[PDB]
Amino acid sequence: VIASGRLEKCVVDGVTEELDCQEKVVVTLTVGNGQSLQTEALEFSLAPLRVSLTKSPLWASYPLQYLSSFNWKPLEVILRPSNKVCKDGDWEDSPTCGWFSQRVADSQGFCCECERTRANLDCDFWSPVSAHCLTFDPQWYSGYELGAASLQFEIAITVEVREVLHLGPSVPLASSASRLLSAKLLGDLAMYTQLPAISNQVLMVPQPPATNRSAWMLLDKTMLSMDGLACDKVGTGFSAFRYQPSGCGRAPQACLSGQLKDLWEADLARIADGRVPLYMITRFTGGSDTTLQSFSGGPLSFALPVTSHSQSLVTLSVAADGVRLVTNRSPGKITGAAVCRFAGTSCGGFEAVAARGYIYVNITNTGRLDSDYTLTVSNCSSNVRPIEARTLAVRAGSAASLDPPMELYVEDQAAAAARTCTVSLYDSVGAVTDSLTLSFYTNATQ
Amino acid sequence: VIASGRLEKCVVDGVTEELDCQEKVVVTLTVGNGQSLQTEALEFSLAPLRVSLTKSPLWASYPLQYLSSFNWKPLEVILRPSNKVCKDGDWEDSPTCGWFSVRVADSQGFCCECTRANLDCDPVSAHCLTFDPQWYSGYELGAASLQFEIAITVEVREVLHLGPSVPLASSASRLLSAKLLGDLAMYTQLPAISNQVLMVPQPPATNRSAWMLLDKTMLSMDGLACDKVGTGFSAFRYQPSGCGRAPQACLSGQLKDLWEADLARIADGRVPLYMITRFTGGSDTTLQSFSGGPLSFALPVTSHSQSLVTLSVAADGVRLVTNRSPGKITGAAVCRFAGTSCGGFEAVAARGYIYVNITNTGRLDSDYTLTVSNCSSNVRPIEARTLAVRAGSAASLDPPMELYVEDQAAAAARTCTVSLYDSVGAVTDSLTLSFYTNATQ
Amino acid sequence: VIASGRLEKCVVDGVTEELDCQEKVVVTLTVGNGQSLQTEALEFSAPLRVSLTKSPLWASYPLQYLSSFNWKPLEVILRPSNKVCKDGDWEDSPTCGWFSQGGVRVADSQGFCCECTRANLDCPVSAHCLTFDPQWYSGYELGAASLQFEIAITVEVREVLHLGPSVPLASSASRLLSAKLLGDLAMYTQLPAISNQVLMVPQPPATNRSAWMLLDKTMLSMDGLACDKVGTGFSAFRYQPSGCGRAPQACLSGQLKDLWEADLARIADGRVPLYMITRFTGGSDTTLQSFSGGPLSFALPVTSHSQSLVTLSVAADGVRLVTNRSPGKITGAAVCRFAGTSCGGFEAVAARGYIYVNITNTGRLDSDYTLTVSNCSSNVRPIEARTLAVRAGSAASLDPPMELYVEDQAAAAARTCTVSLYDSVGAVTDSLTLSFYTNATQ
Ligand SMILES: *[C@@H]1O[C@H](CO)[C@@H](O)[C@H](O)[C@H]1NC(C)=O
Ligand SMILES: *[C@@H]1O[C@H](CO)[C@@H](O)[C@H](O)[C@H]1NC(C)=O
Ligand SMILES: *[C@@H]1O[C@H](CO)[C@@H](O)[C@H](O)[C@H]1NC(C)=O
Ligand SMILES: *[C@@H]1O[C@H](CO)[C@H](O)[C@H](O)[C@H]1NC(C)=O
Ligand SMILES: *[C@@H]1O[C@H](CO)[C@H](O)[C@H](O)[C@H]1NC(C)=O
Ligand SMILES: *[C@@H]1O[C@H](CO)[C@H](O)[C@H](O)[C@H]1NC(C)=O
Numbered sequence A: 001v002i003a004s005g006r007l008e009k010c011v012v013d014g015v016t017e018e019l020d021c022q023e024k025v026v027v028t029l030t031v032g033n034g035q036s037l038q039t040e041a042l043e044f045s046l047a048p049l050r051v052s053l054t055k056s057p058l059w060a061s062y063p064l065q066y067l068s069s070f071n072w073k074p075l076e077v078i079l080r081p082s083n084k085v086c087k088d089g090d091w092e093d094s095p096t097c098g099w100f101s102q103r104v105a106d107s108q109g110f111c112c113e114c115e116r117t118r119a120n121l122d123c124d125f126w127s128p129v130s131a132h133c134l135t136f137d138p139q140w141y142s143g144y145e146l147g148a149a150s151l152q153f154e155i156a157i158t159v160e161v162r163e164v165l166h167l168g169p170s171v172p173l174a175s176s177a178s179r180l181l182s183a184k185l186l187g188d189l190a191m192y193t194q195l196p197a198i199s200n201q202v203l204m205v206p207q208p209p210a211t212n213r214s215a216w217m218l219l220d221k222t223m224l225s226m227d228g229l230a231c232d233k234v235g236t237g238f239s240a241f242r243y244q245p246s247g248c249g250r251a252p253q254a255c256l257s258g259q260l261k262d263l264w265e266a267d268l269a270r271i272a273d274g275r276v277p278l279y280m281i282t283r284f285t286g287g288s289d290t291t292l293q294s295f296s297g298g299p300l301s302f303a304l305p306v307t308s309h310s311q312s313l314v315t316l317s318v319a320a321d322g323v324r325l326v327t328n329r330s331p332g333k334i335t336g337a338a339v340c341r342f343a344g345t346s347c348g349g350f351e352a353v354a355a356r357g358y359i360y361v362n363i364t365n366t367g368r369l370d371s372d373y374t375l376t377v378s379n380c381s382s383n384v385r386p387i388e389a390r391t392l393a394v395r396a397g398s399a400a401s402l403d404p405p406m407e408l409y410v411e412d413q414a415a416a417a418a419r420t421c422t423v424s425l426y427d428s429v430g431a432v433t434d435s436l437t438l439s440f441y442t443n444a445t446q
Numbered sequence B: 001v002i003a004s005g006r007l008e009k010c011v012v013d014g015v016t017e018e019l020d021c022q023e024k025v026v027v028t029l030t031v032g033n034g035q036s037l038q039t040e041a042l043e044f045s046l047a048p049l050r051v052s053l054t055k056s057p058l059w060a061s062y063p064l065q066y067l068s069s070f071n072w073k074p075l076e077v078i079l080r081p082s083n084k085v086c087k088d089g090d091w092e093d094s095p096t097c098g099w100f101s102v103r104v105a106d107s108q109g110f111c112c113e114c115t116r117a118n119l120d121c122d123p124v125s126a127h128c129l130t131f132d133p134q135w136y137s138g139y140e141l142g143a144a145s146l147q148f149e150i151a152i153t154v155e156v157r158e159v160l161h162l163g164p165s166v167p168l169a170s171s172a173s174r175l176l177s178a179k180l181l182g183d184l185a186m187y188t189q190l191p192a193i194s195n196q197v198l199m200v201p202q203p204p205a206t207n208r209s210a211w212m213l214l215d216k217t218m219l220s221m222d223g224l225a226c227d228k229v230g231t232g233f234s235a236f237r238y239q240p241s242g243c244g245r246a247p248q249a250c251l252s253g254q255l256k257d258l259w260e261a262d263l264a265r266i267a268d269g270r271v272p273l274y275m276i277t278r279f280t281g282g283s284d285t286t287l288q289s290f291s292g293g294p295l296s297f298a299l300p301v302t303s304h305s306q307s308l309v310t311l312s313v314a315a316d317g318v319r320l321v322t323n324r325s326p327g328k329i330t331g332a333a334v335c336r337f338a339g340t341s342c343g344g345f346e347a348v349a350a351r352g353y354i355y356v357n358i359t360n361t362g363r364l365d366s367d368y369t370l371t372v373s374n375c376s377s378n379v380r381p382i383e384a385r386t387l388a389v390r391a392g393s394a395a396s397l398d399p400p401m402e403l404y405v406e407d408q409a410a411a412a413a414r415t416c417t418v419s420l421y422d423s424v425g426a427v428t429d430s431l432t433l434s435f436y437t438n439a440t441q
Numbered sequence C: 001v002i003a004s005g006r007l008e009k010c011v012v013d014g015v016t017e018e019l020d021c022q023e024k025v026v027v028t029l030t031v032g033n034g035q036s037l038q039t040e041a042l043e044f045s046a047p048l049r050v051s052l053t054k055s056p057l058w059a060s061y062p063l064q065y066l067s068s069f070n071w072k073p074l075e076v077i078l079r080p081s082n083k084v085c086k087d088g089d090w091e092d093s094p095t096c097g098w099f100s101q102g103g104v105r106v107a108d109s110q111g112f113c114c115e116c117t118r119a120n121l122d123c124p125v126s127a128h129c130l131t132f133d134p135q136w137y138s139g140y141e142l143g144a145a146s147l148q149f150e151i152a153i154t155v156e157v158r159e160v161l162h163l164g165p166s167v168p169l170a171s172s173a174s175r176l177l178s179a180k181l182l183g184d185l186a187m188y189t190q191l192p193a194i195s196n197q198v199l200m201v202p203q204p205p206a207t208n209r210s211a212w213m214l215l216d217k218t219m220l221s222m223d224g225l226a227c228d229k230v231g232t233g234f235s236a237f238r239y240q241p242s243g244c245g246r247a248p249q250a251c252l253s254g255q256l257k258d259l260w261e262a263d264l265a266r267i268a269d270g271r272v273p274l275y276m277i278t279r280f281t282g283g284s285d286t287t288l289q290s291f292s293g294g295p296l297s298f299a300l301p302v303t304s305h306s307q308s309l310v311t312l313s314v315a316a317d318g319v320r321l322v323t324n325r326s327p328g329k330i331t332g333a334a335v336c337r338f339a340g341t342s343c344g345g346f347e348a349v350a351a352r353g354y355i356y357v358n359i360t361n362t363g364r365l366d367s368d369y370t371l372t373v374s375n376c377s378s379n380v381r382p383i384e385a386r387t388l389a390v391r392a393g394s395a396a397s398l399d400p401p402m403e404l405y406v407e408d409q410a411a412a413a414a415r416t417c418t419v420s421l422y423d424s425v426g427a428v429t430d431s432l433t434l435s436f437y438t439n440a441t442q
Helices: A118-122 A260-272 B116-120 B255-267 C256-268
Strands: A006-013 A019-031 A040-045 A048-055 A059-062 A064-071 A075-079 A110-112 A130-135 A140-146 A150-152 A155-160 A164-167 A175-178 A181-188 A202-206 A217-219 A302-305 A312-318 A323-329 A332-340 A349-351 A357-365 A371-378 A390-394 A399-401 A406-408 A416-427 A430-442 B006-013 B019-031 B040-045 B048-055 B059-062 B064-071 B075-079 B110-112 B125-130 B135-141 B145-147 B150-155 B170-173 B176-183 B197-201 B212-214 B297-300 B307-313 B318-324 B327-335 B344-346 B352-360 B366-373 B385-389 B394-396 B401-403 B411-422 B425-437 C006-013 C019-031 C040-044 C048-054 C058-061 C063-070 C074-078 C112-114 C126-131 C136-142 C146-148 C151-156 C160-163 C171-174 C177-184 C198-202 C213-215 C298-301 C308-314 C319-325 C328-336 C345-347 C353-361 C367-374 C386-390 C395-397 C402-406 C412-423 C426-438
Touching (some): A064 A202, A110 A118, A118 A130, A140 A217, A155 A181, A164 A175, A217 A260, A357 A371, A357 A390, A357 A430, B064 B197, B110 B116, B150 B307, B327 B411, B352 B425, C048 C308, C136 C213, C151 C308, C213 C256, C328 C426, C353 C426
Parallel strands (some): A349 A430, B006 C319, B344 B425
Antiparallel strands (some): A059 A302, A332 A357, A357 A406, A371 A416, B040 B318, B048 B150, B075 B125, B327 B352, B352 B394, B352 B401, B366 B411, C040 C319, C048 C151, C074 C126, C112 C126, C136 C198, C151 C160, C177 C308, C328 C353
């Protein structure tokens, strides 16, 4: 809650010209990112009017715009005619490879005469030409250019006298009313940790025919041959495969590296070495795809869960005169805390600089009331990148955890086994419990 | 308005050391993006002091920094010597193509004997790089800075403006001193253009219409790569195949090819990828309204950015007076980029543009809120809009509301509820109907 | 200060179920980016003196190591004299000799031979070998910026109790007073788009962060398959398009050294560098050195306003605001090129000016000041105001200078701006800067 007060709100009617003045109670208040429970309420004297606010989980949705389709892994098929006649040139009546149709330009591959190299392979003692044709993997992906992030949430105002009524201000519905009470969402304050710079990257969704969004990849424009003219880029086509620099003096599948498959396989290898993948959309979550699945949007939508604080400003205008704030102050306990690698490869520590840790913390509301809690990773040892605090609305008696874990970074590529952090837990002003995490960080390799 | 109150503001003078305490009325209040009219006012009791705030149209300006010049469409020119002698190599003083000037490296082009070489068989030929007369200057865009101005009209016939803005965070007028704290975060973030290269045609059409904004991936800055906006003499000569490649082989994907490809996108009811009009929705007129100089670039801000202004008045007592004029939605349509057609768009591969005409059906200039809510399945939510409309007069959303679908499904009965609110309650609502023909490819 | 008021704050205990209501004074206030000094204070009724200060704001970007990169790979041309150059794969004794990095023979490290630009020089054979500069660099992919600061809330009864709410510690308390940092408002000038670029730190073994570069992903061959990029290998150097028909160092352009040198040439022509991390500051590396983080950290000083919202809850009933209002004087103002190449002006559009302003607190009290560059001539890009907390009698300056831009590539020598200095509401002095802009070349 920002500040309460009394003000005479006058309304000069647009048609009648008559002004109607009524003294109202104008209360501006803060609604946190993780304020998903009925912890606090406001009581207005008019019998008291109980008003309580809750904010849905915040999401940063990016609009999709289809660009082109990209194949999972194109392949070179070396055809040896046996009749020793290969003629695959431009404006050719009948090439060995044959034209690809949706006649696609430069889809006829190339001929080569006499690791080994396209030409060197043709040289058989027993036999002297061969065609090199581009073929596509049965699986295709569709490339979508992500747009600008827009914060998607919903604020639920539960007005009660008796009979209860729910008001829903949000981003598309900034204002809401119910005769005695009219509330307006002004907007929220800036996030301390900005969103990832993914507002221009290309999202790779597999064209149908394991989990919804698990196979998805997000690629930088630097790794894509959009025109299909560059070599060894996601989208290298027939025009790039044919006309490649050396051609016959290069090993087969030469211009076919750096494809979706290759990048996917490379990312698996990164996860295996306890390093964060570079292309898999799970790089933002921390390993699990389940976090993203919880998003409300349609099949072709992309949104990341927001972990940074975004305090929404809501102004309430009540005809009632007098206000009181009532808040639940239930104690808590940290029922576990561990620093683990990407996708829970291992625990206890990570690789300095070349990788990052993920702080998973289990907490428990040790009371009879549903209360809001604040988890802080402070008083850390040398060269540890500070982590922004977290809010947790936890139900009475029940236990909770940070679904997207807190990312952990080190500002030195040093080898260590005794690195520490102080995991504090606060409830509605004062600290209820604290533990001391211990992370190891095996020095950066290369 | 955030919250009003009374506080004793004491000032310990820096030279005299004497403290001067005066009880003042401290009022913090928002100022919306589209609050360009005198709708609401504040009355302070000291005869009432009428104070009213307005915010100019918001713009996100990006600073320009010249990098290099880029040609419109470099062309390959094929010369057949007839004397059957092609002289084009490094150190050779009289090449067939001739050096470009002093002597630019690899400008001599290249030779092909017996696609380029296949054509010669009718016998050597010379392939020379030539440039289009039109050139464009490349400017690297910097970081966006929100540009606006808040006008505070203090009145007790005597009216006094006060202009707090981004370069002038504070303002005063003896009895009243106001400070712009800053505005809240936009719900829809700005487009990621803070590093792209702006292509302005070098002089010697409309002001900013010919302009293009290109990603750094589509520019060969060193002029060594092929088929990029910046590829030069050194790239044309030394191309992968060379003679075995068709004429105009290294010269694809230039400013002309990108512009041409973009007009084709608009034609197929798809948003262009390079034209600066991709942010507006078709019209260049929206951008022309920007205050800046010839070499400036700014995009109109459509997301809400509620500015926080704190007023300190020596007067004791405050009242808020607001105009509540009704409105009417005098039209609503979902149309393609640059008004190609209306009624619908192409699912995912394109986007719709909601154009809404409204009318202030009253005697007072009032603020209105337009919302596109209660939409059908897989429709991407659209953030609300504010409209300060003069009495009796009609208005429209100049930059239209962008419309997206979260499925590449073929549909003809897609719906949205366009509600119009005036200073708390809904005065009218319509029901838009969009068709989305499924994504092709 | 936003708004003060009185409210009954009730606490329903989670275990005892008993509600405890206490009427408190709830004050929401604003702490500026450059509010480092004790200028203003709050007096709660013997008065309780409470004063807020905000540390210098920084935008830190998390590092993630990608790969290592050499300073300037060099081509060493060897002419064997015995006229025998045989450098191919699987040959045990090549002229260049194999490179060993993992105790094993690195592929394509043998270079290439040329008979009778690389072959024109020989005029009968020669070897072309790739060698590395002793200096190596480490490529780190920058992550998303996170604002790093600390708010210090001094409480005085007697006893000096100092509270520290910040980004990792949003809340703080001290029995009578409990404060919460809600968050700060959005910056008018957004941060530079560096959240995806690759930071080049030289591998150890002149100044900490001076040699550092920040490169766009377009300028690196990560797979090492492209020619003339920051990352082109032995493999890229060999198998190059022409080879023997191209001048030495043909596939070794645009390396770290090459870019660095190009940037010194830009600074020399009074233009802002494109790769040097000093492009954000204004020339000096000293500004960045002041950052609290570890050796492998990167943060830029925030010059745009970021007003933090802090709400104070005191059991005391009654509040008064006391502020120091010391006058000031602009003791110099100049528009200078990057890294102070020259002064008086800059190059229109192709470059930018840097407004350096010296100010002086001409009073007995430490006070907060506002510096504004307003009422400027035609086609001058507006500059956001600055806050300065200056100690009594002492002089101060804008450490990161105000960037100056022109919205026309016109030649002008009489361009003007009105530099105004405000102190805790009213303007105490004003000068009139005069910049020259020599028109854009090319
Ligand atoms: C948290 O609890 C889950 C079960 O809910 C358990 O599997 C996990 O090991 C716990 N982690 C920590 C850090 O306590
Ligand atoms: C809005 O009104 C203009 C004329 O004022 C008209 O050209 C346009 O078609 C109208 N559009 C809608 C959606 O009503
Ligand atoms: C500011 O003062 C320093 C010395 O304190 C001097 O070196 C510098 O040139 C001055 N600059 C201006 C613009 O007054
Ligand atoms: C990281 O360091 C710890 C230190 O106890 C362990 O030894 C662990 O095995 C190290 N990891 C690697 C991959 O060497
Ligand atoms: C989009 O679908 C609607 C469905 O009624 C129309 O038939 C329209 O013609 C379609 N557009 C195209 C280009 O096929
Ligand atoms: C910039 O223009 C002014 C105009 O008076 C000066 O002549 C100055 O010498 C110019 N700079 C250059 C490099 O020509």
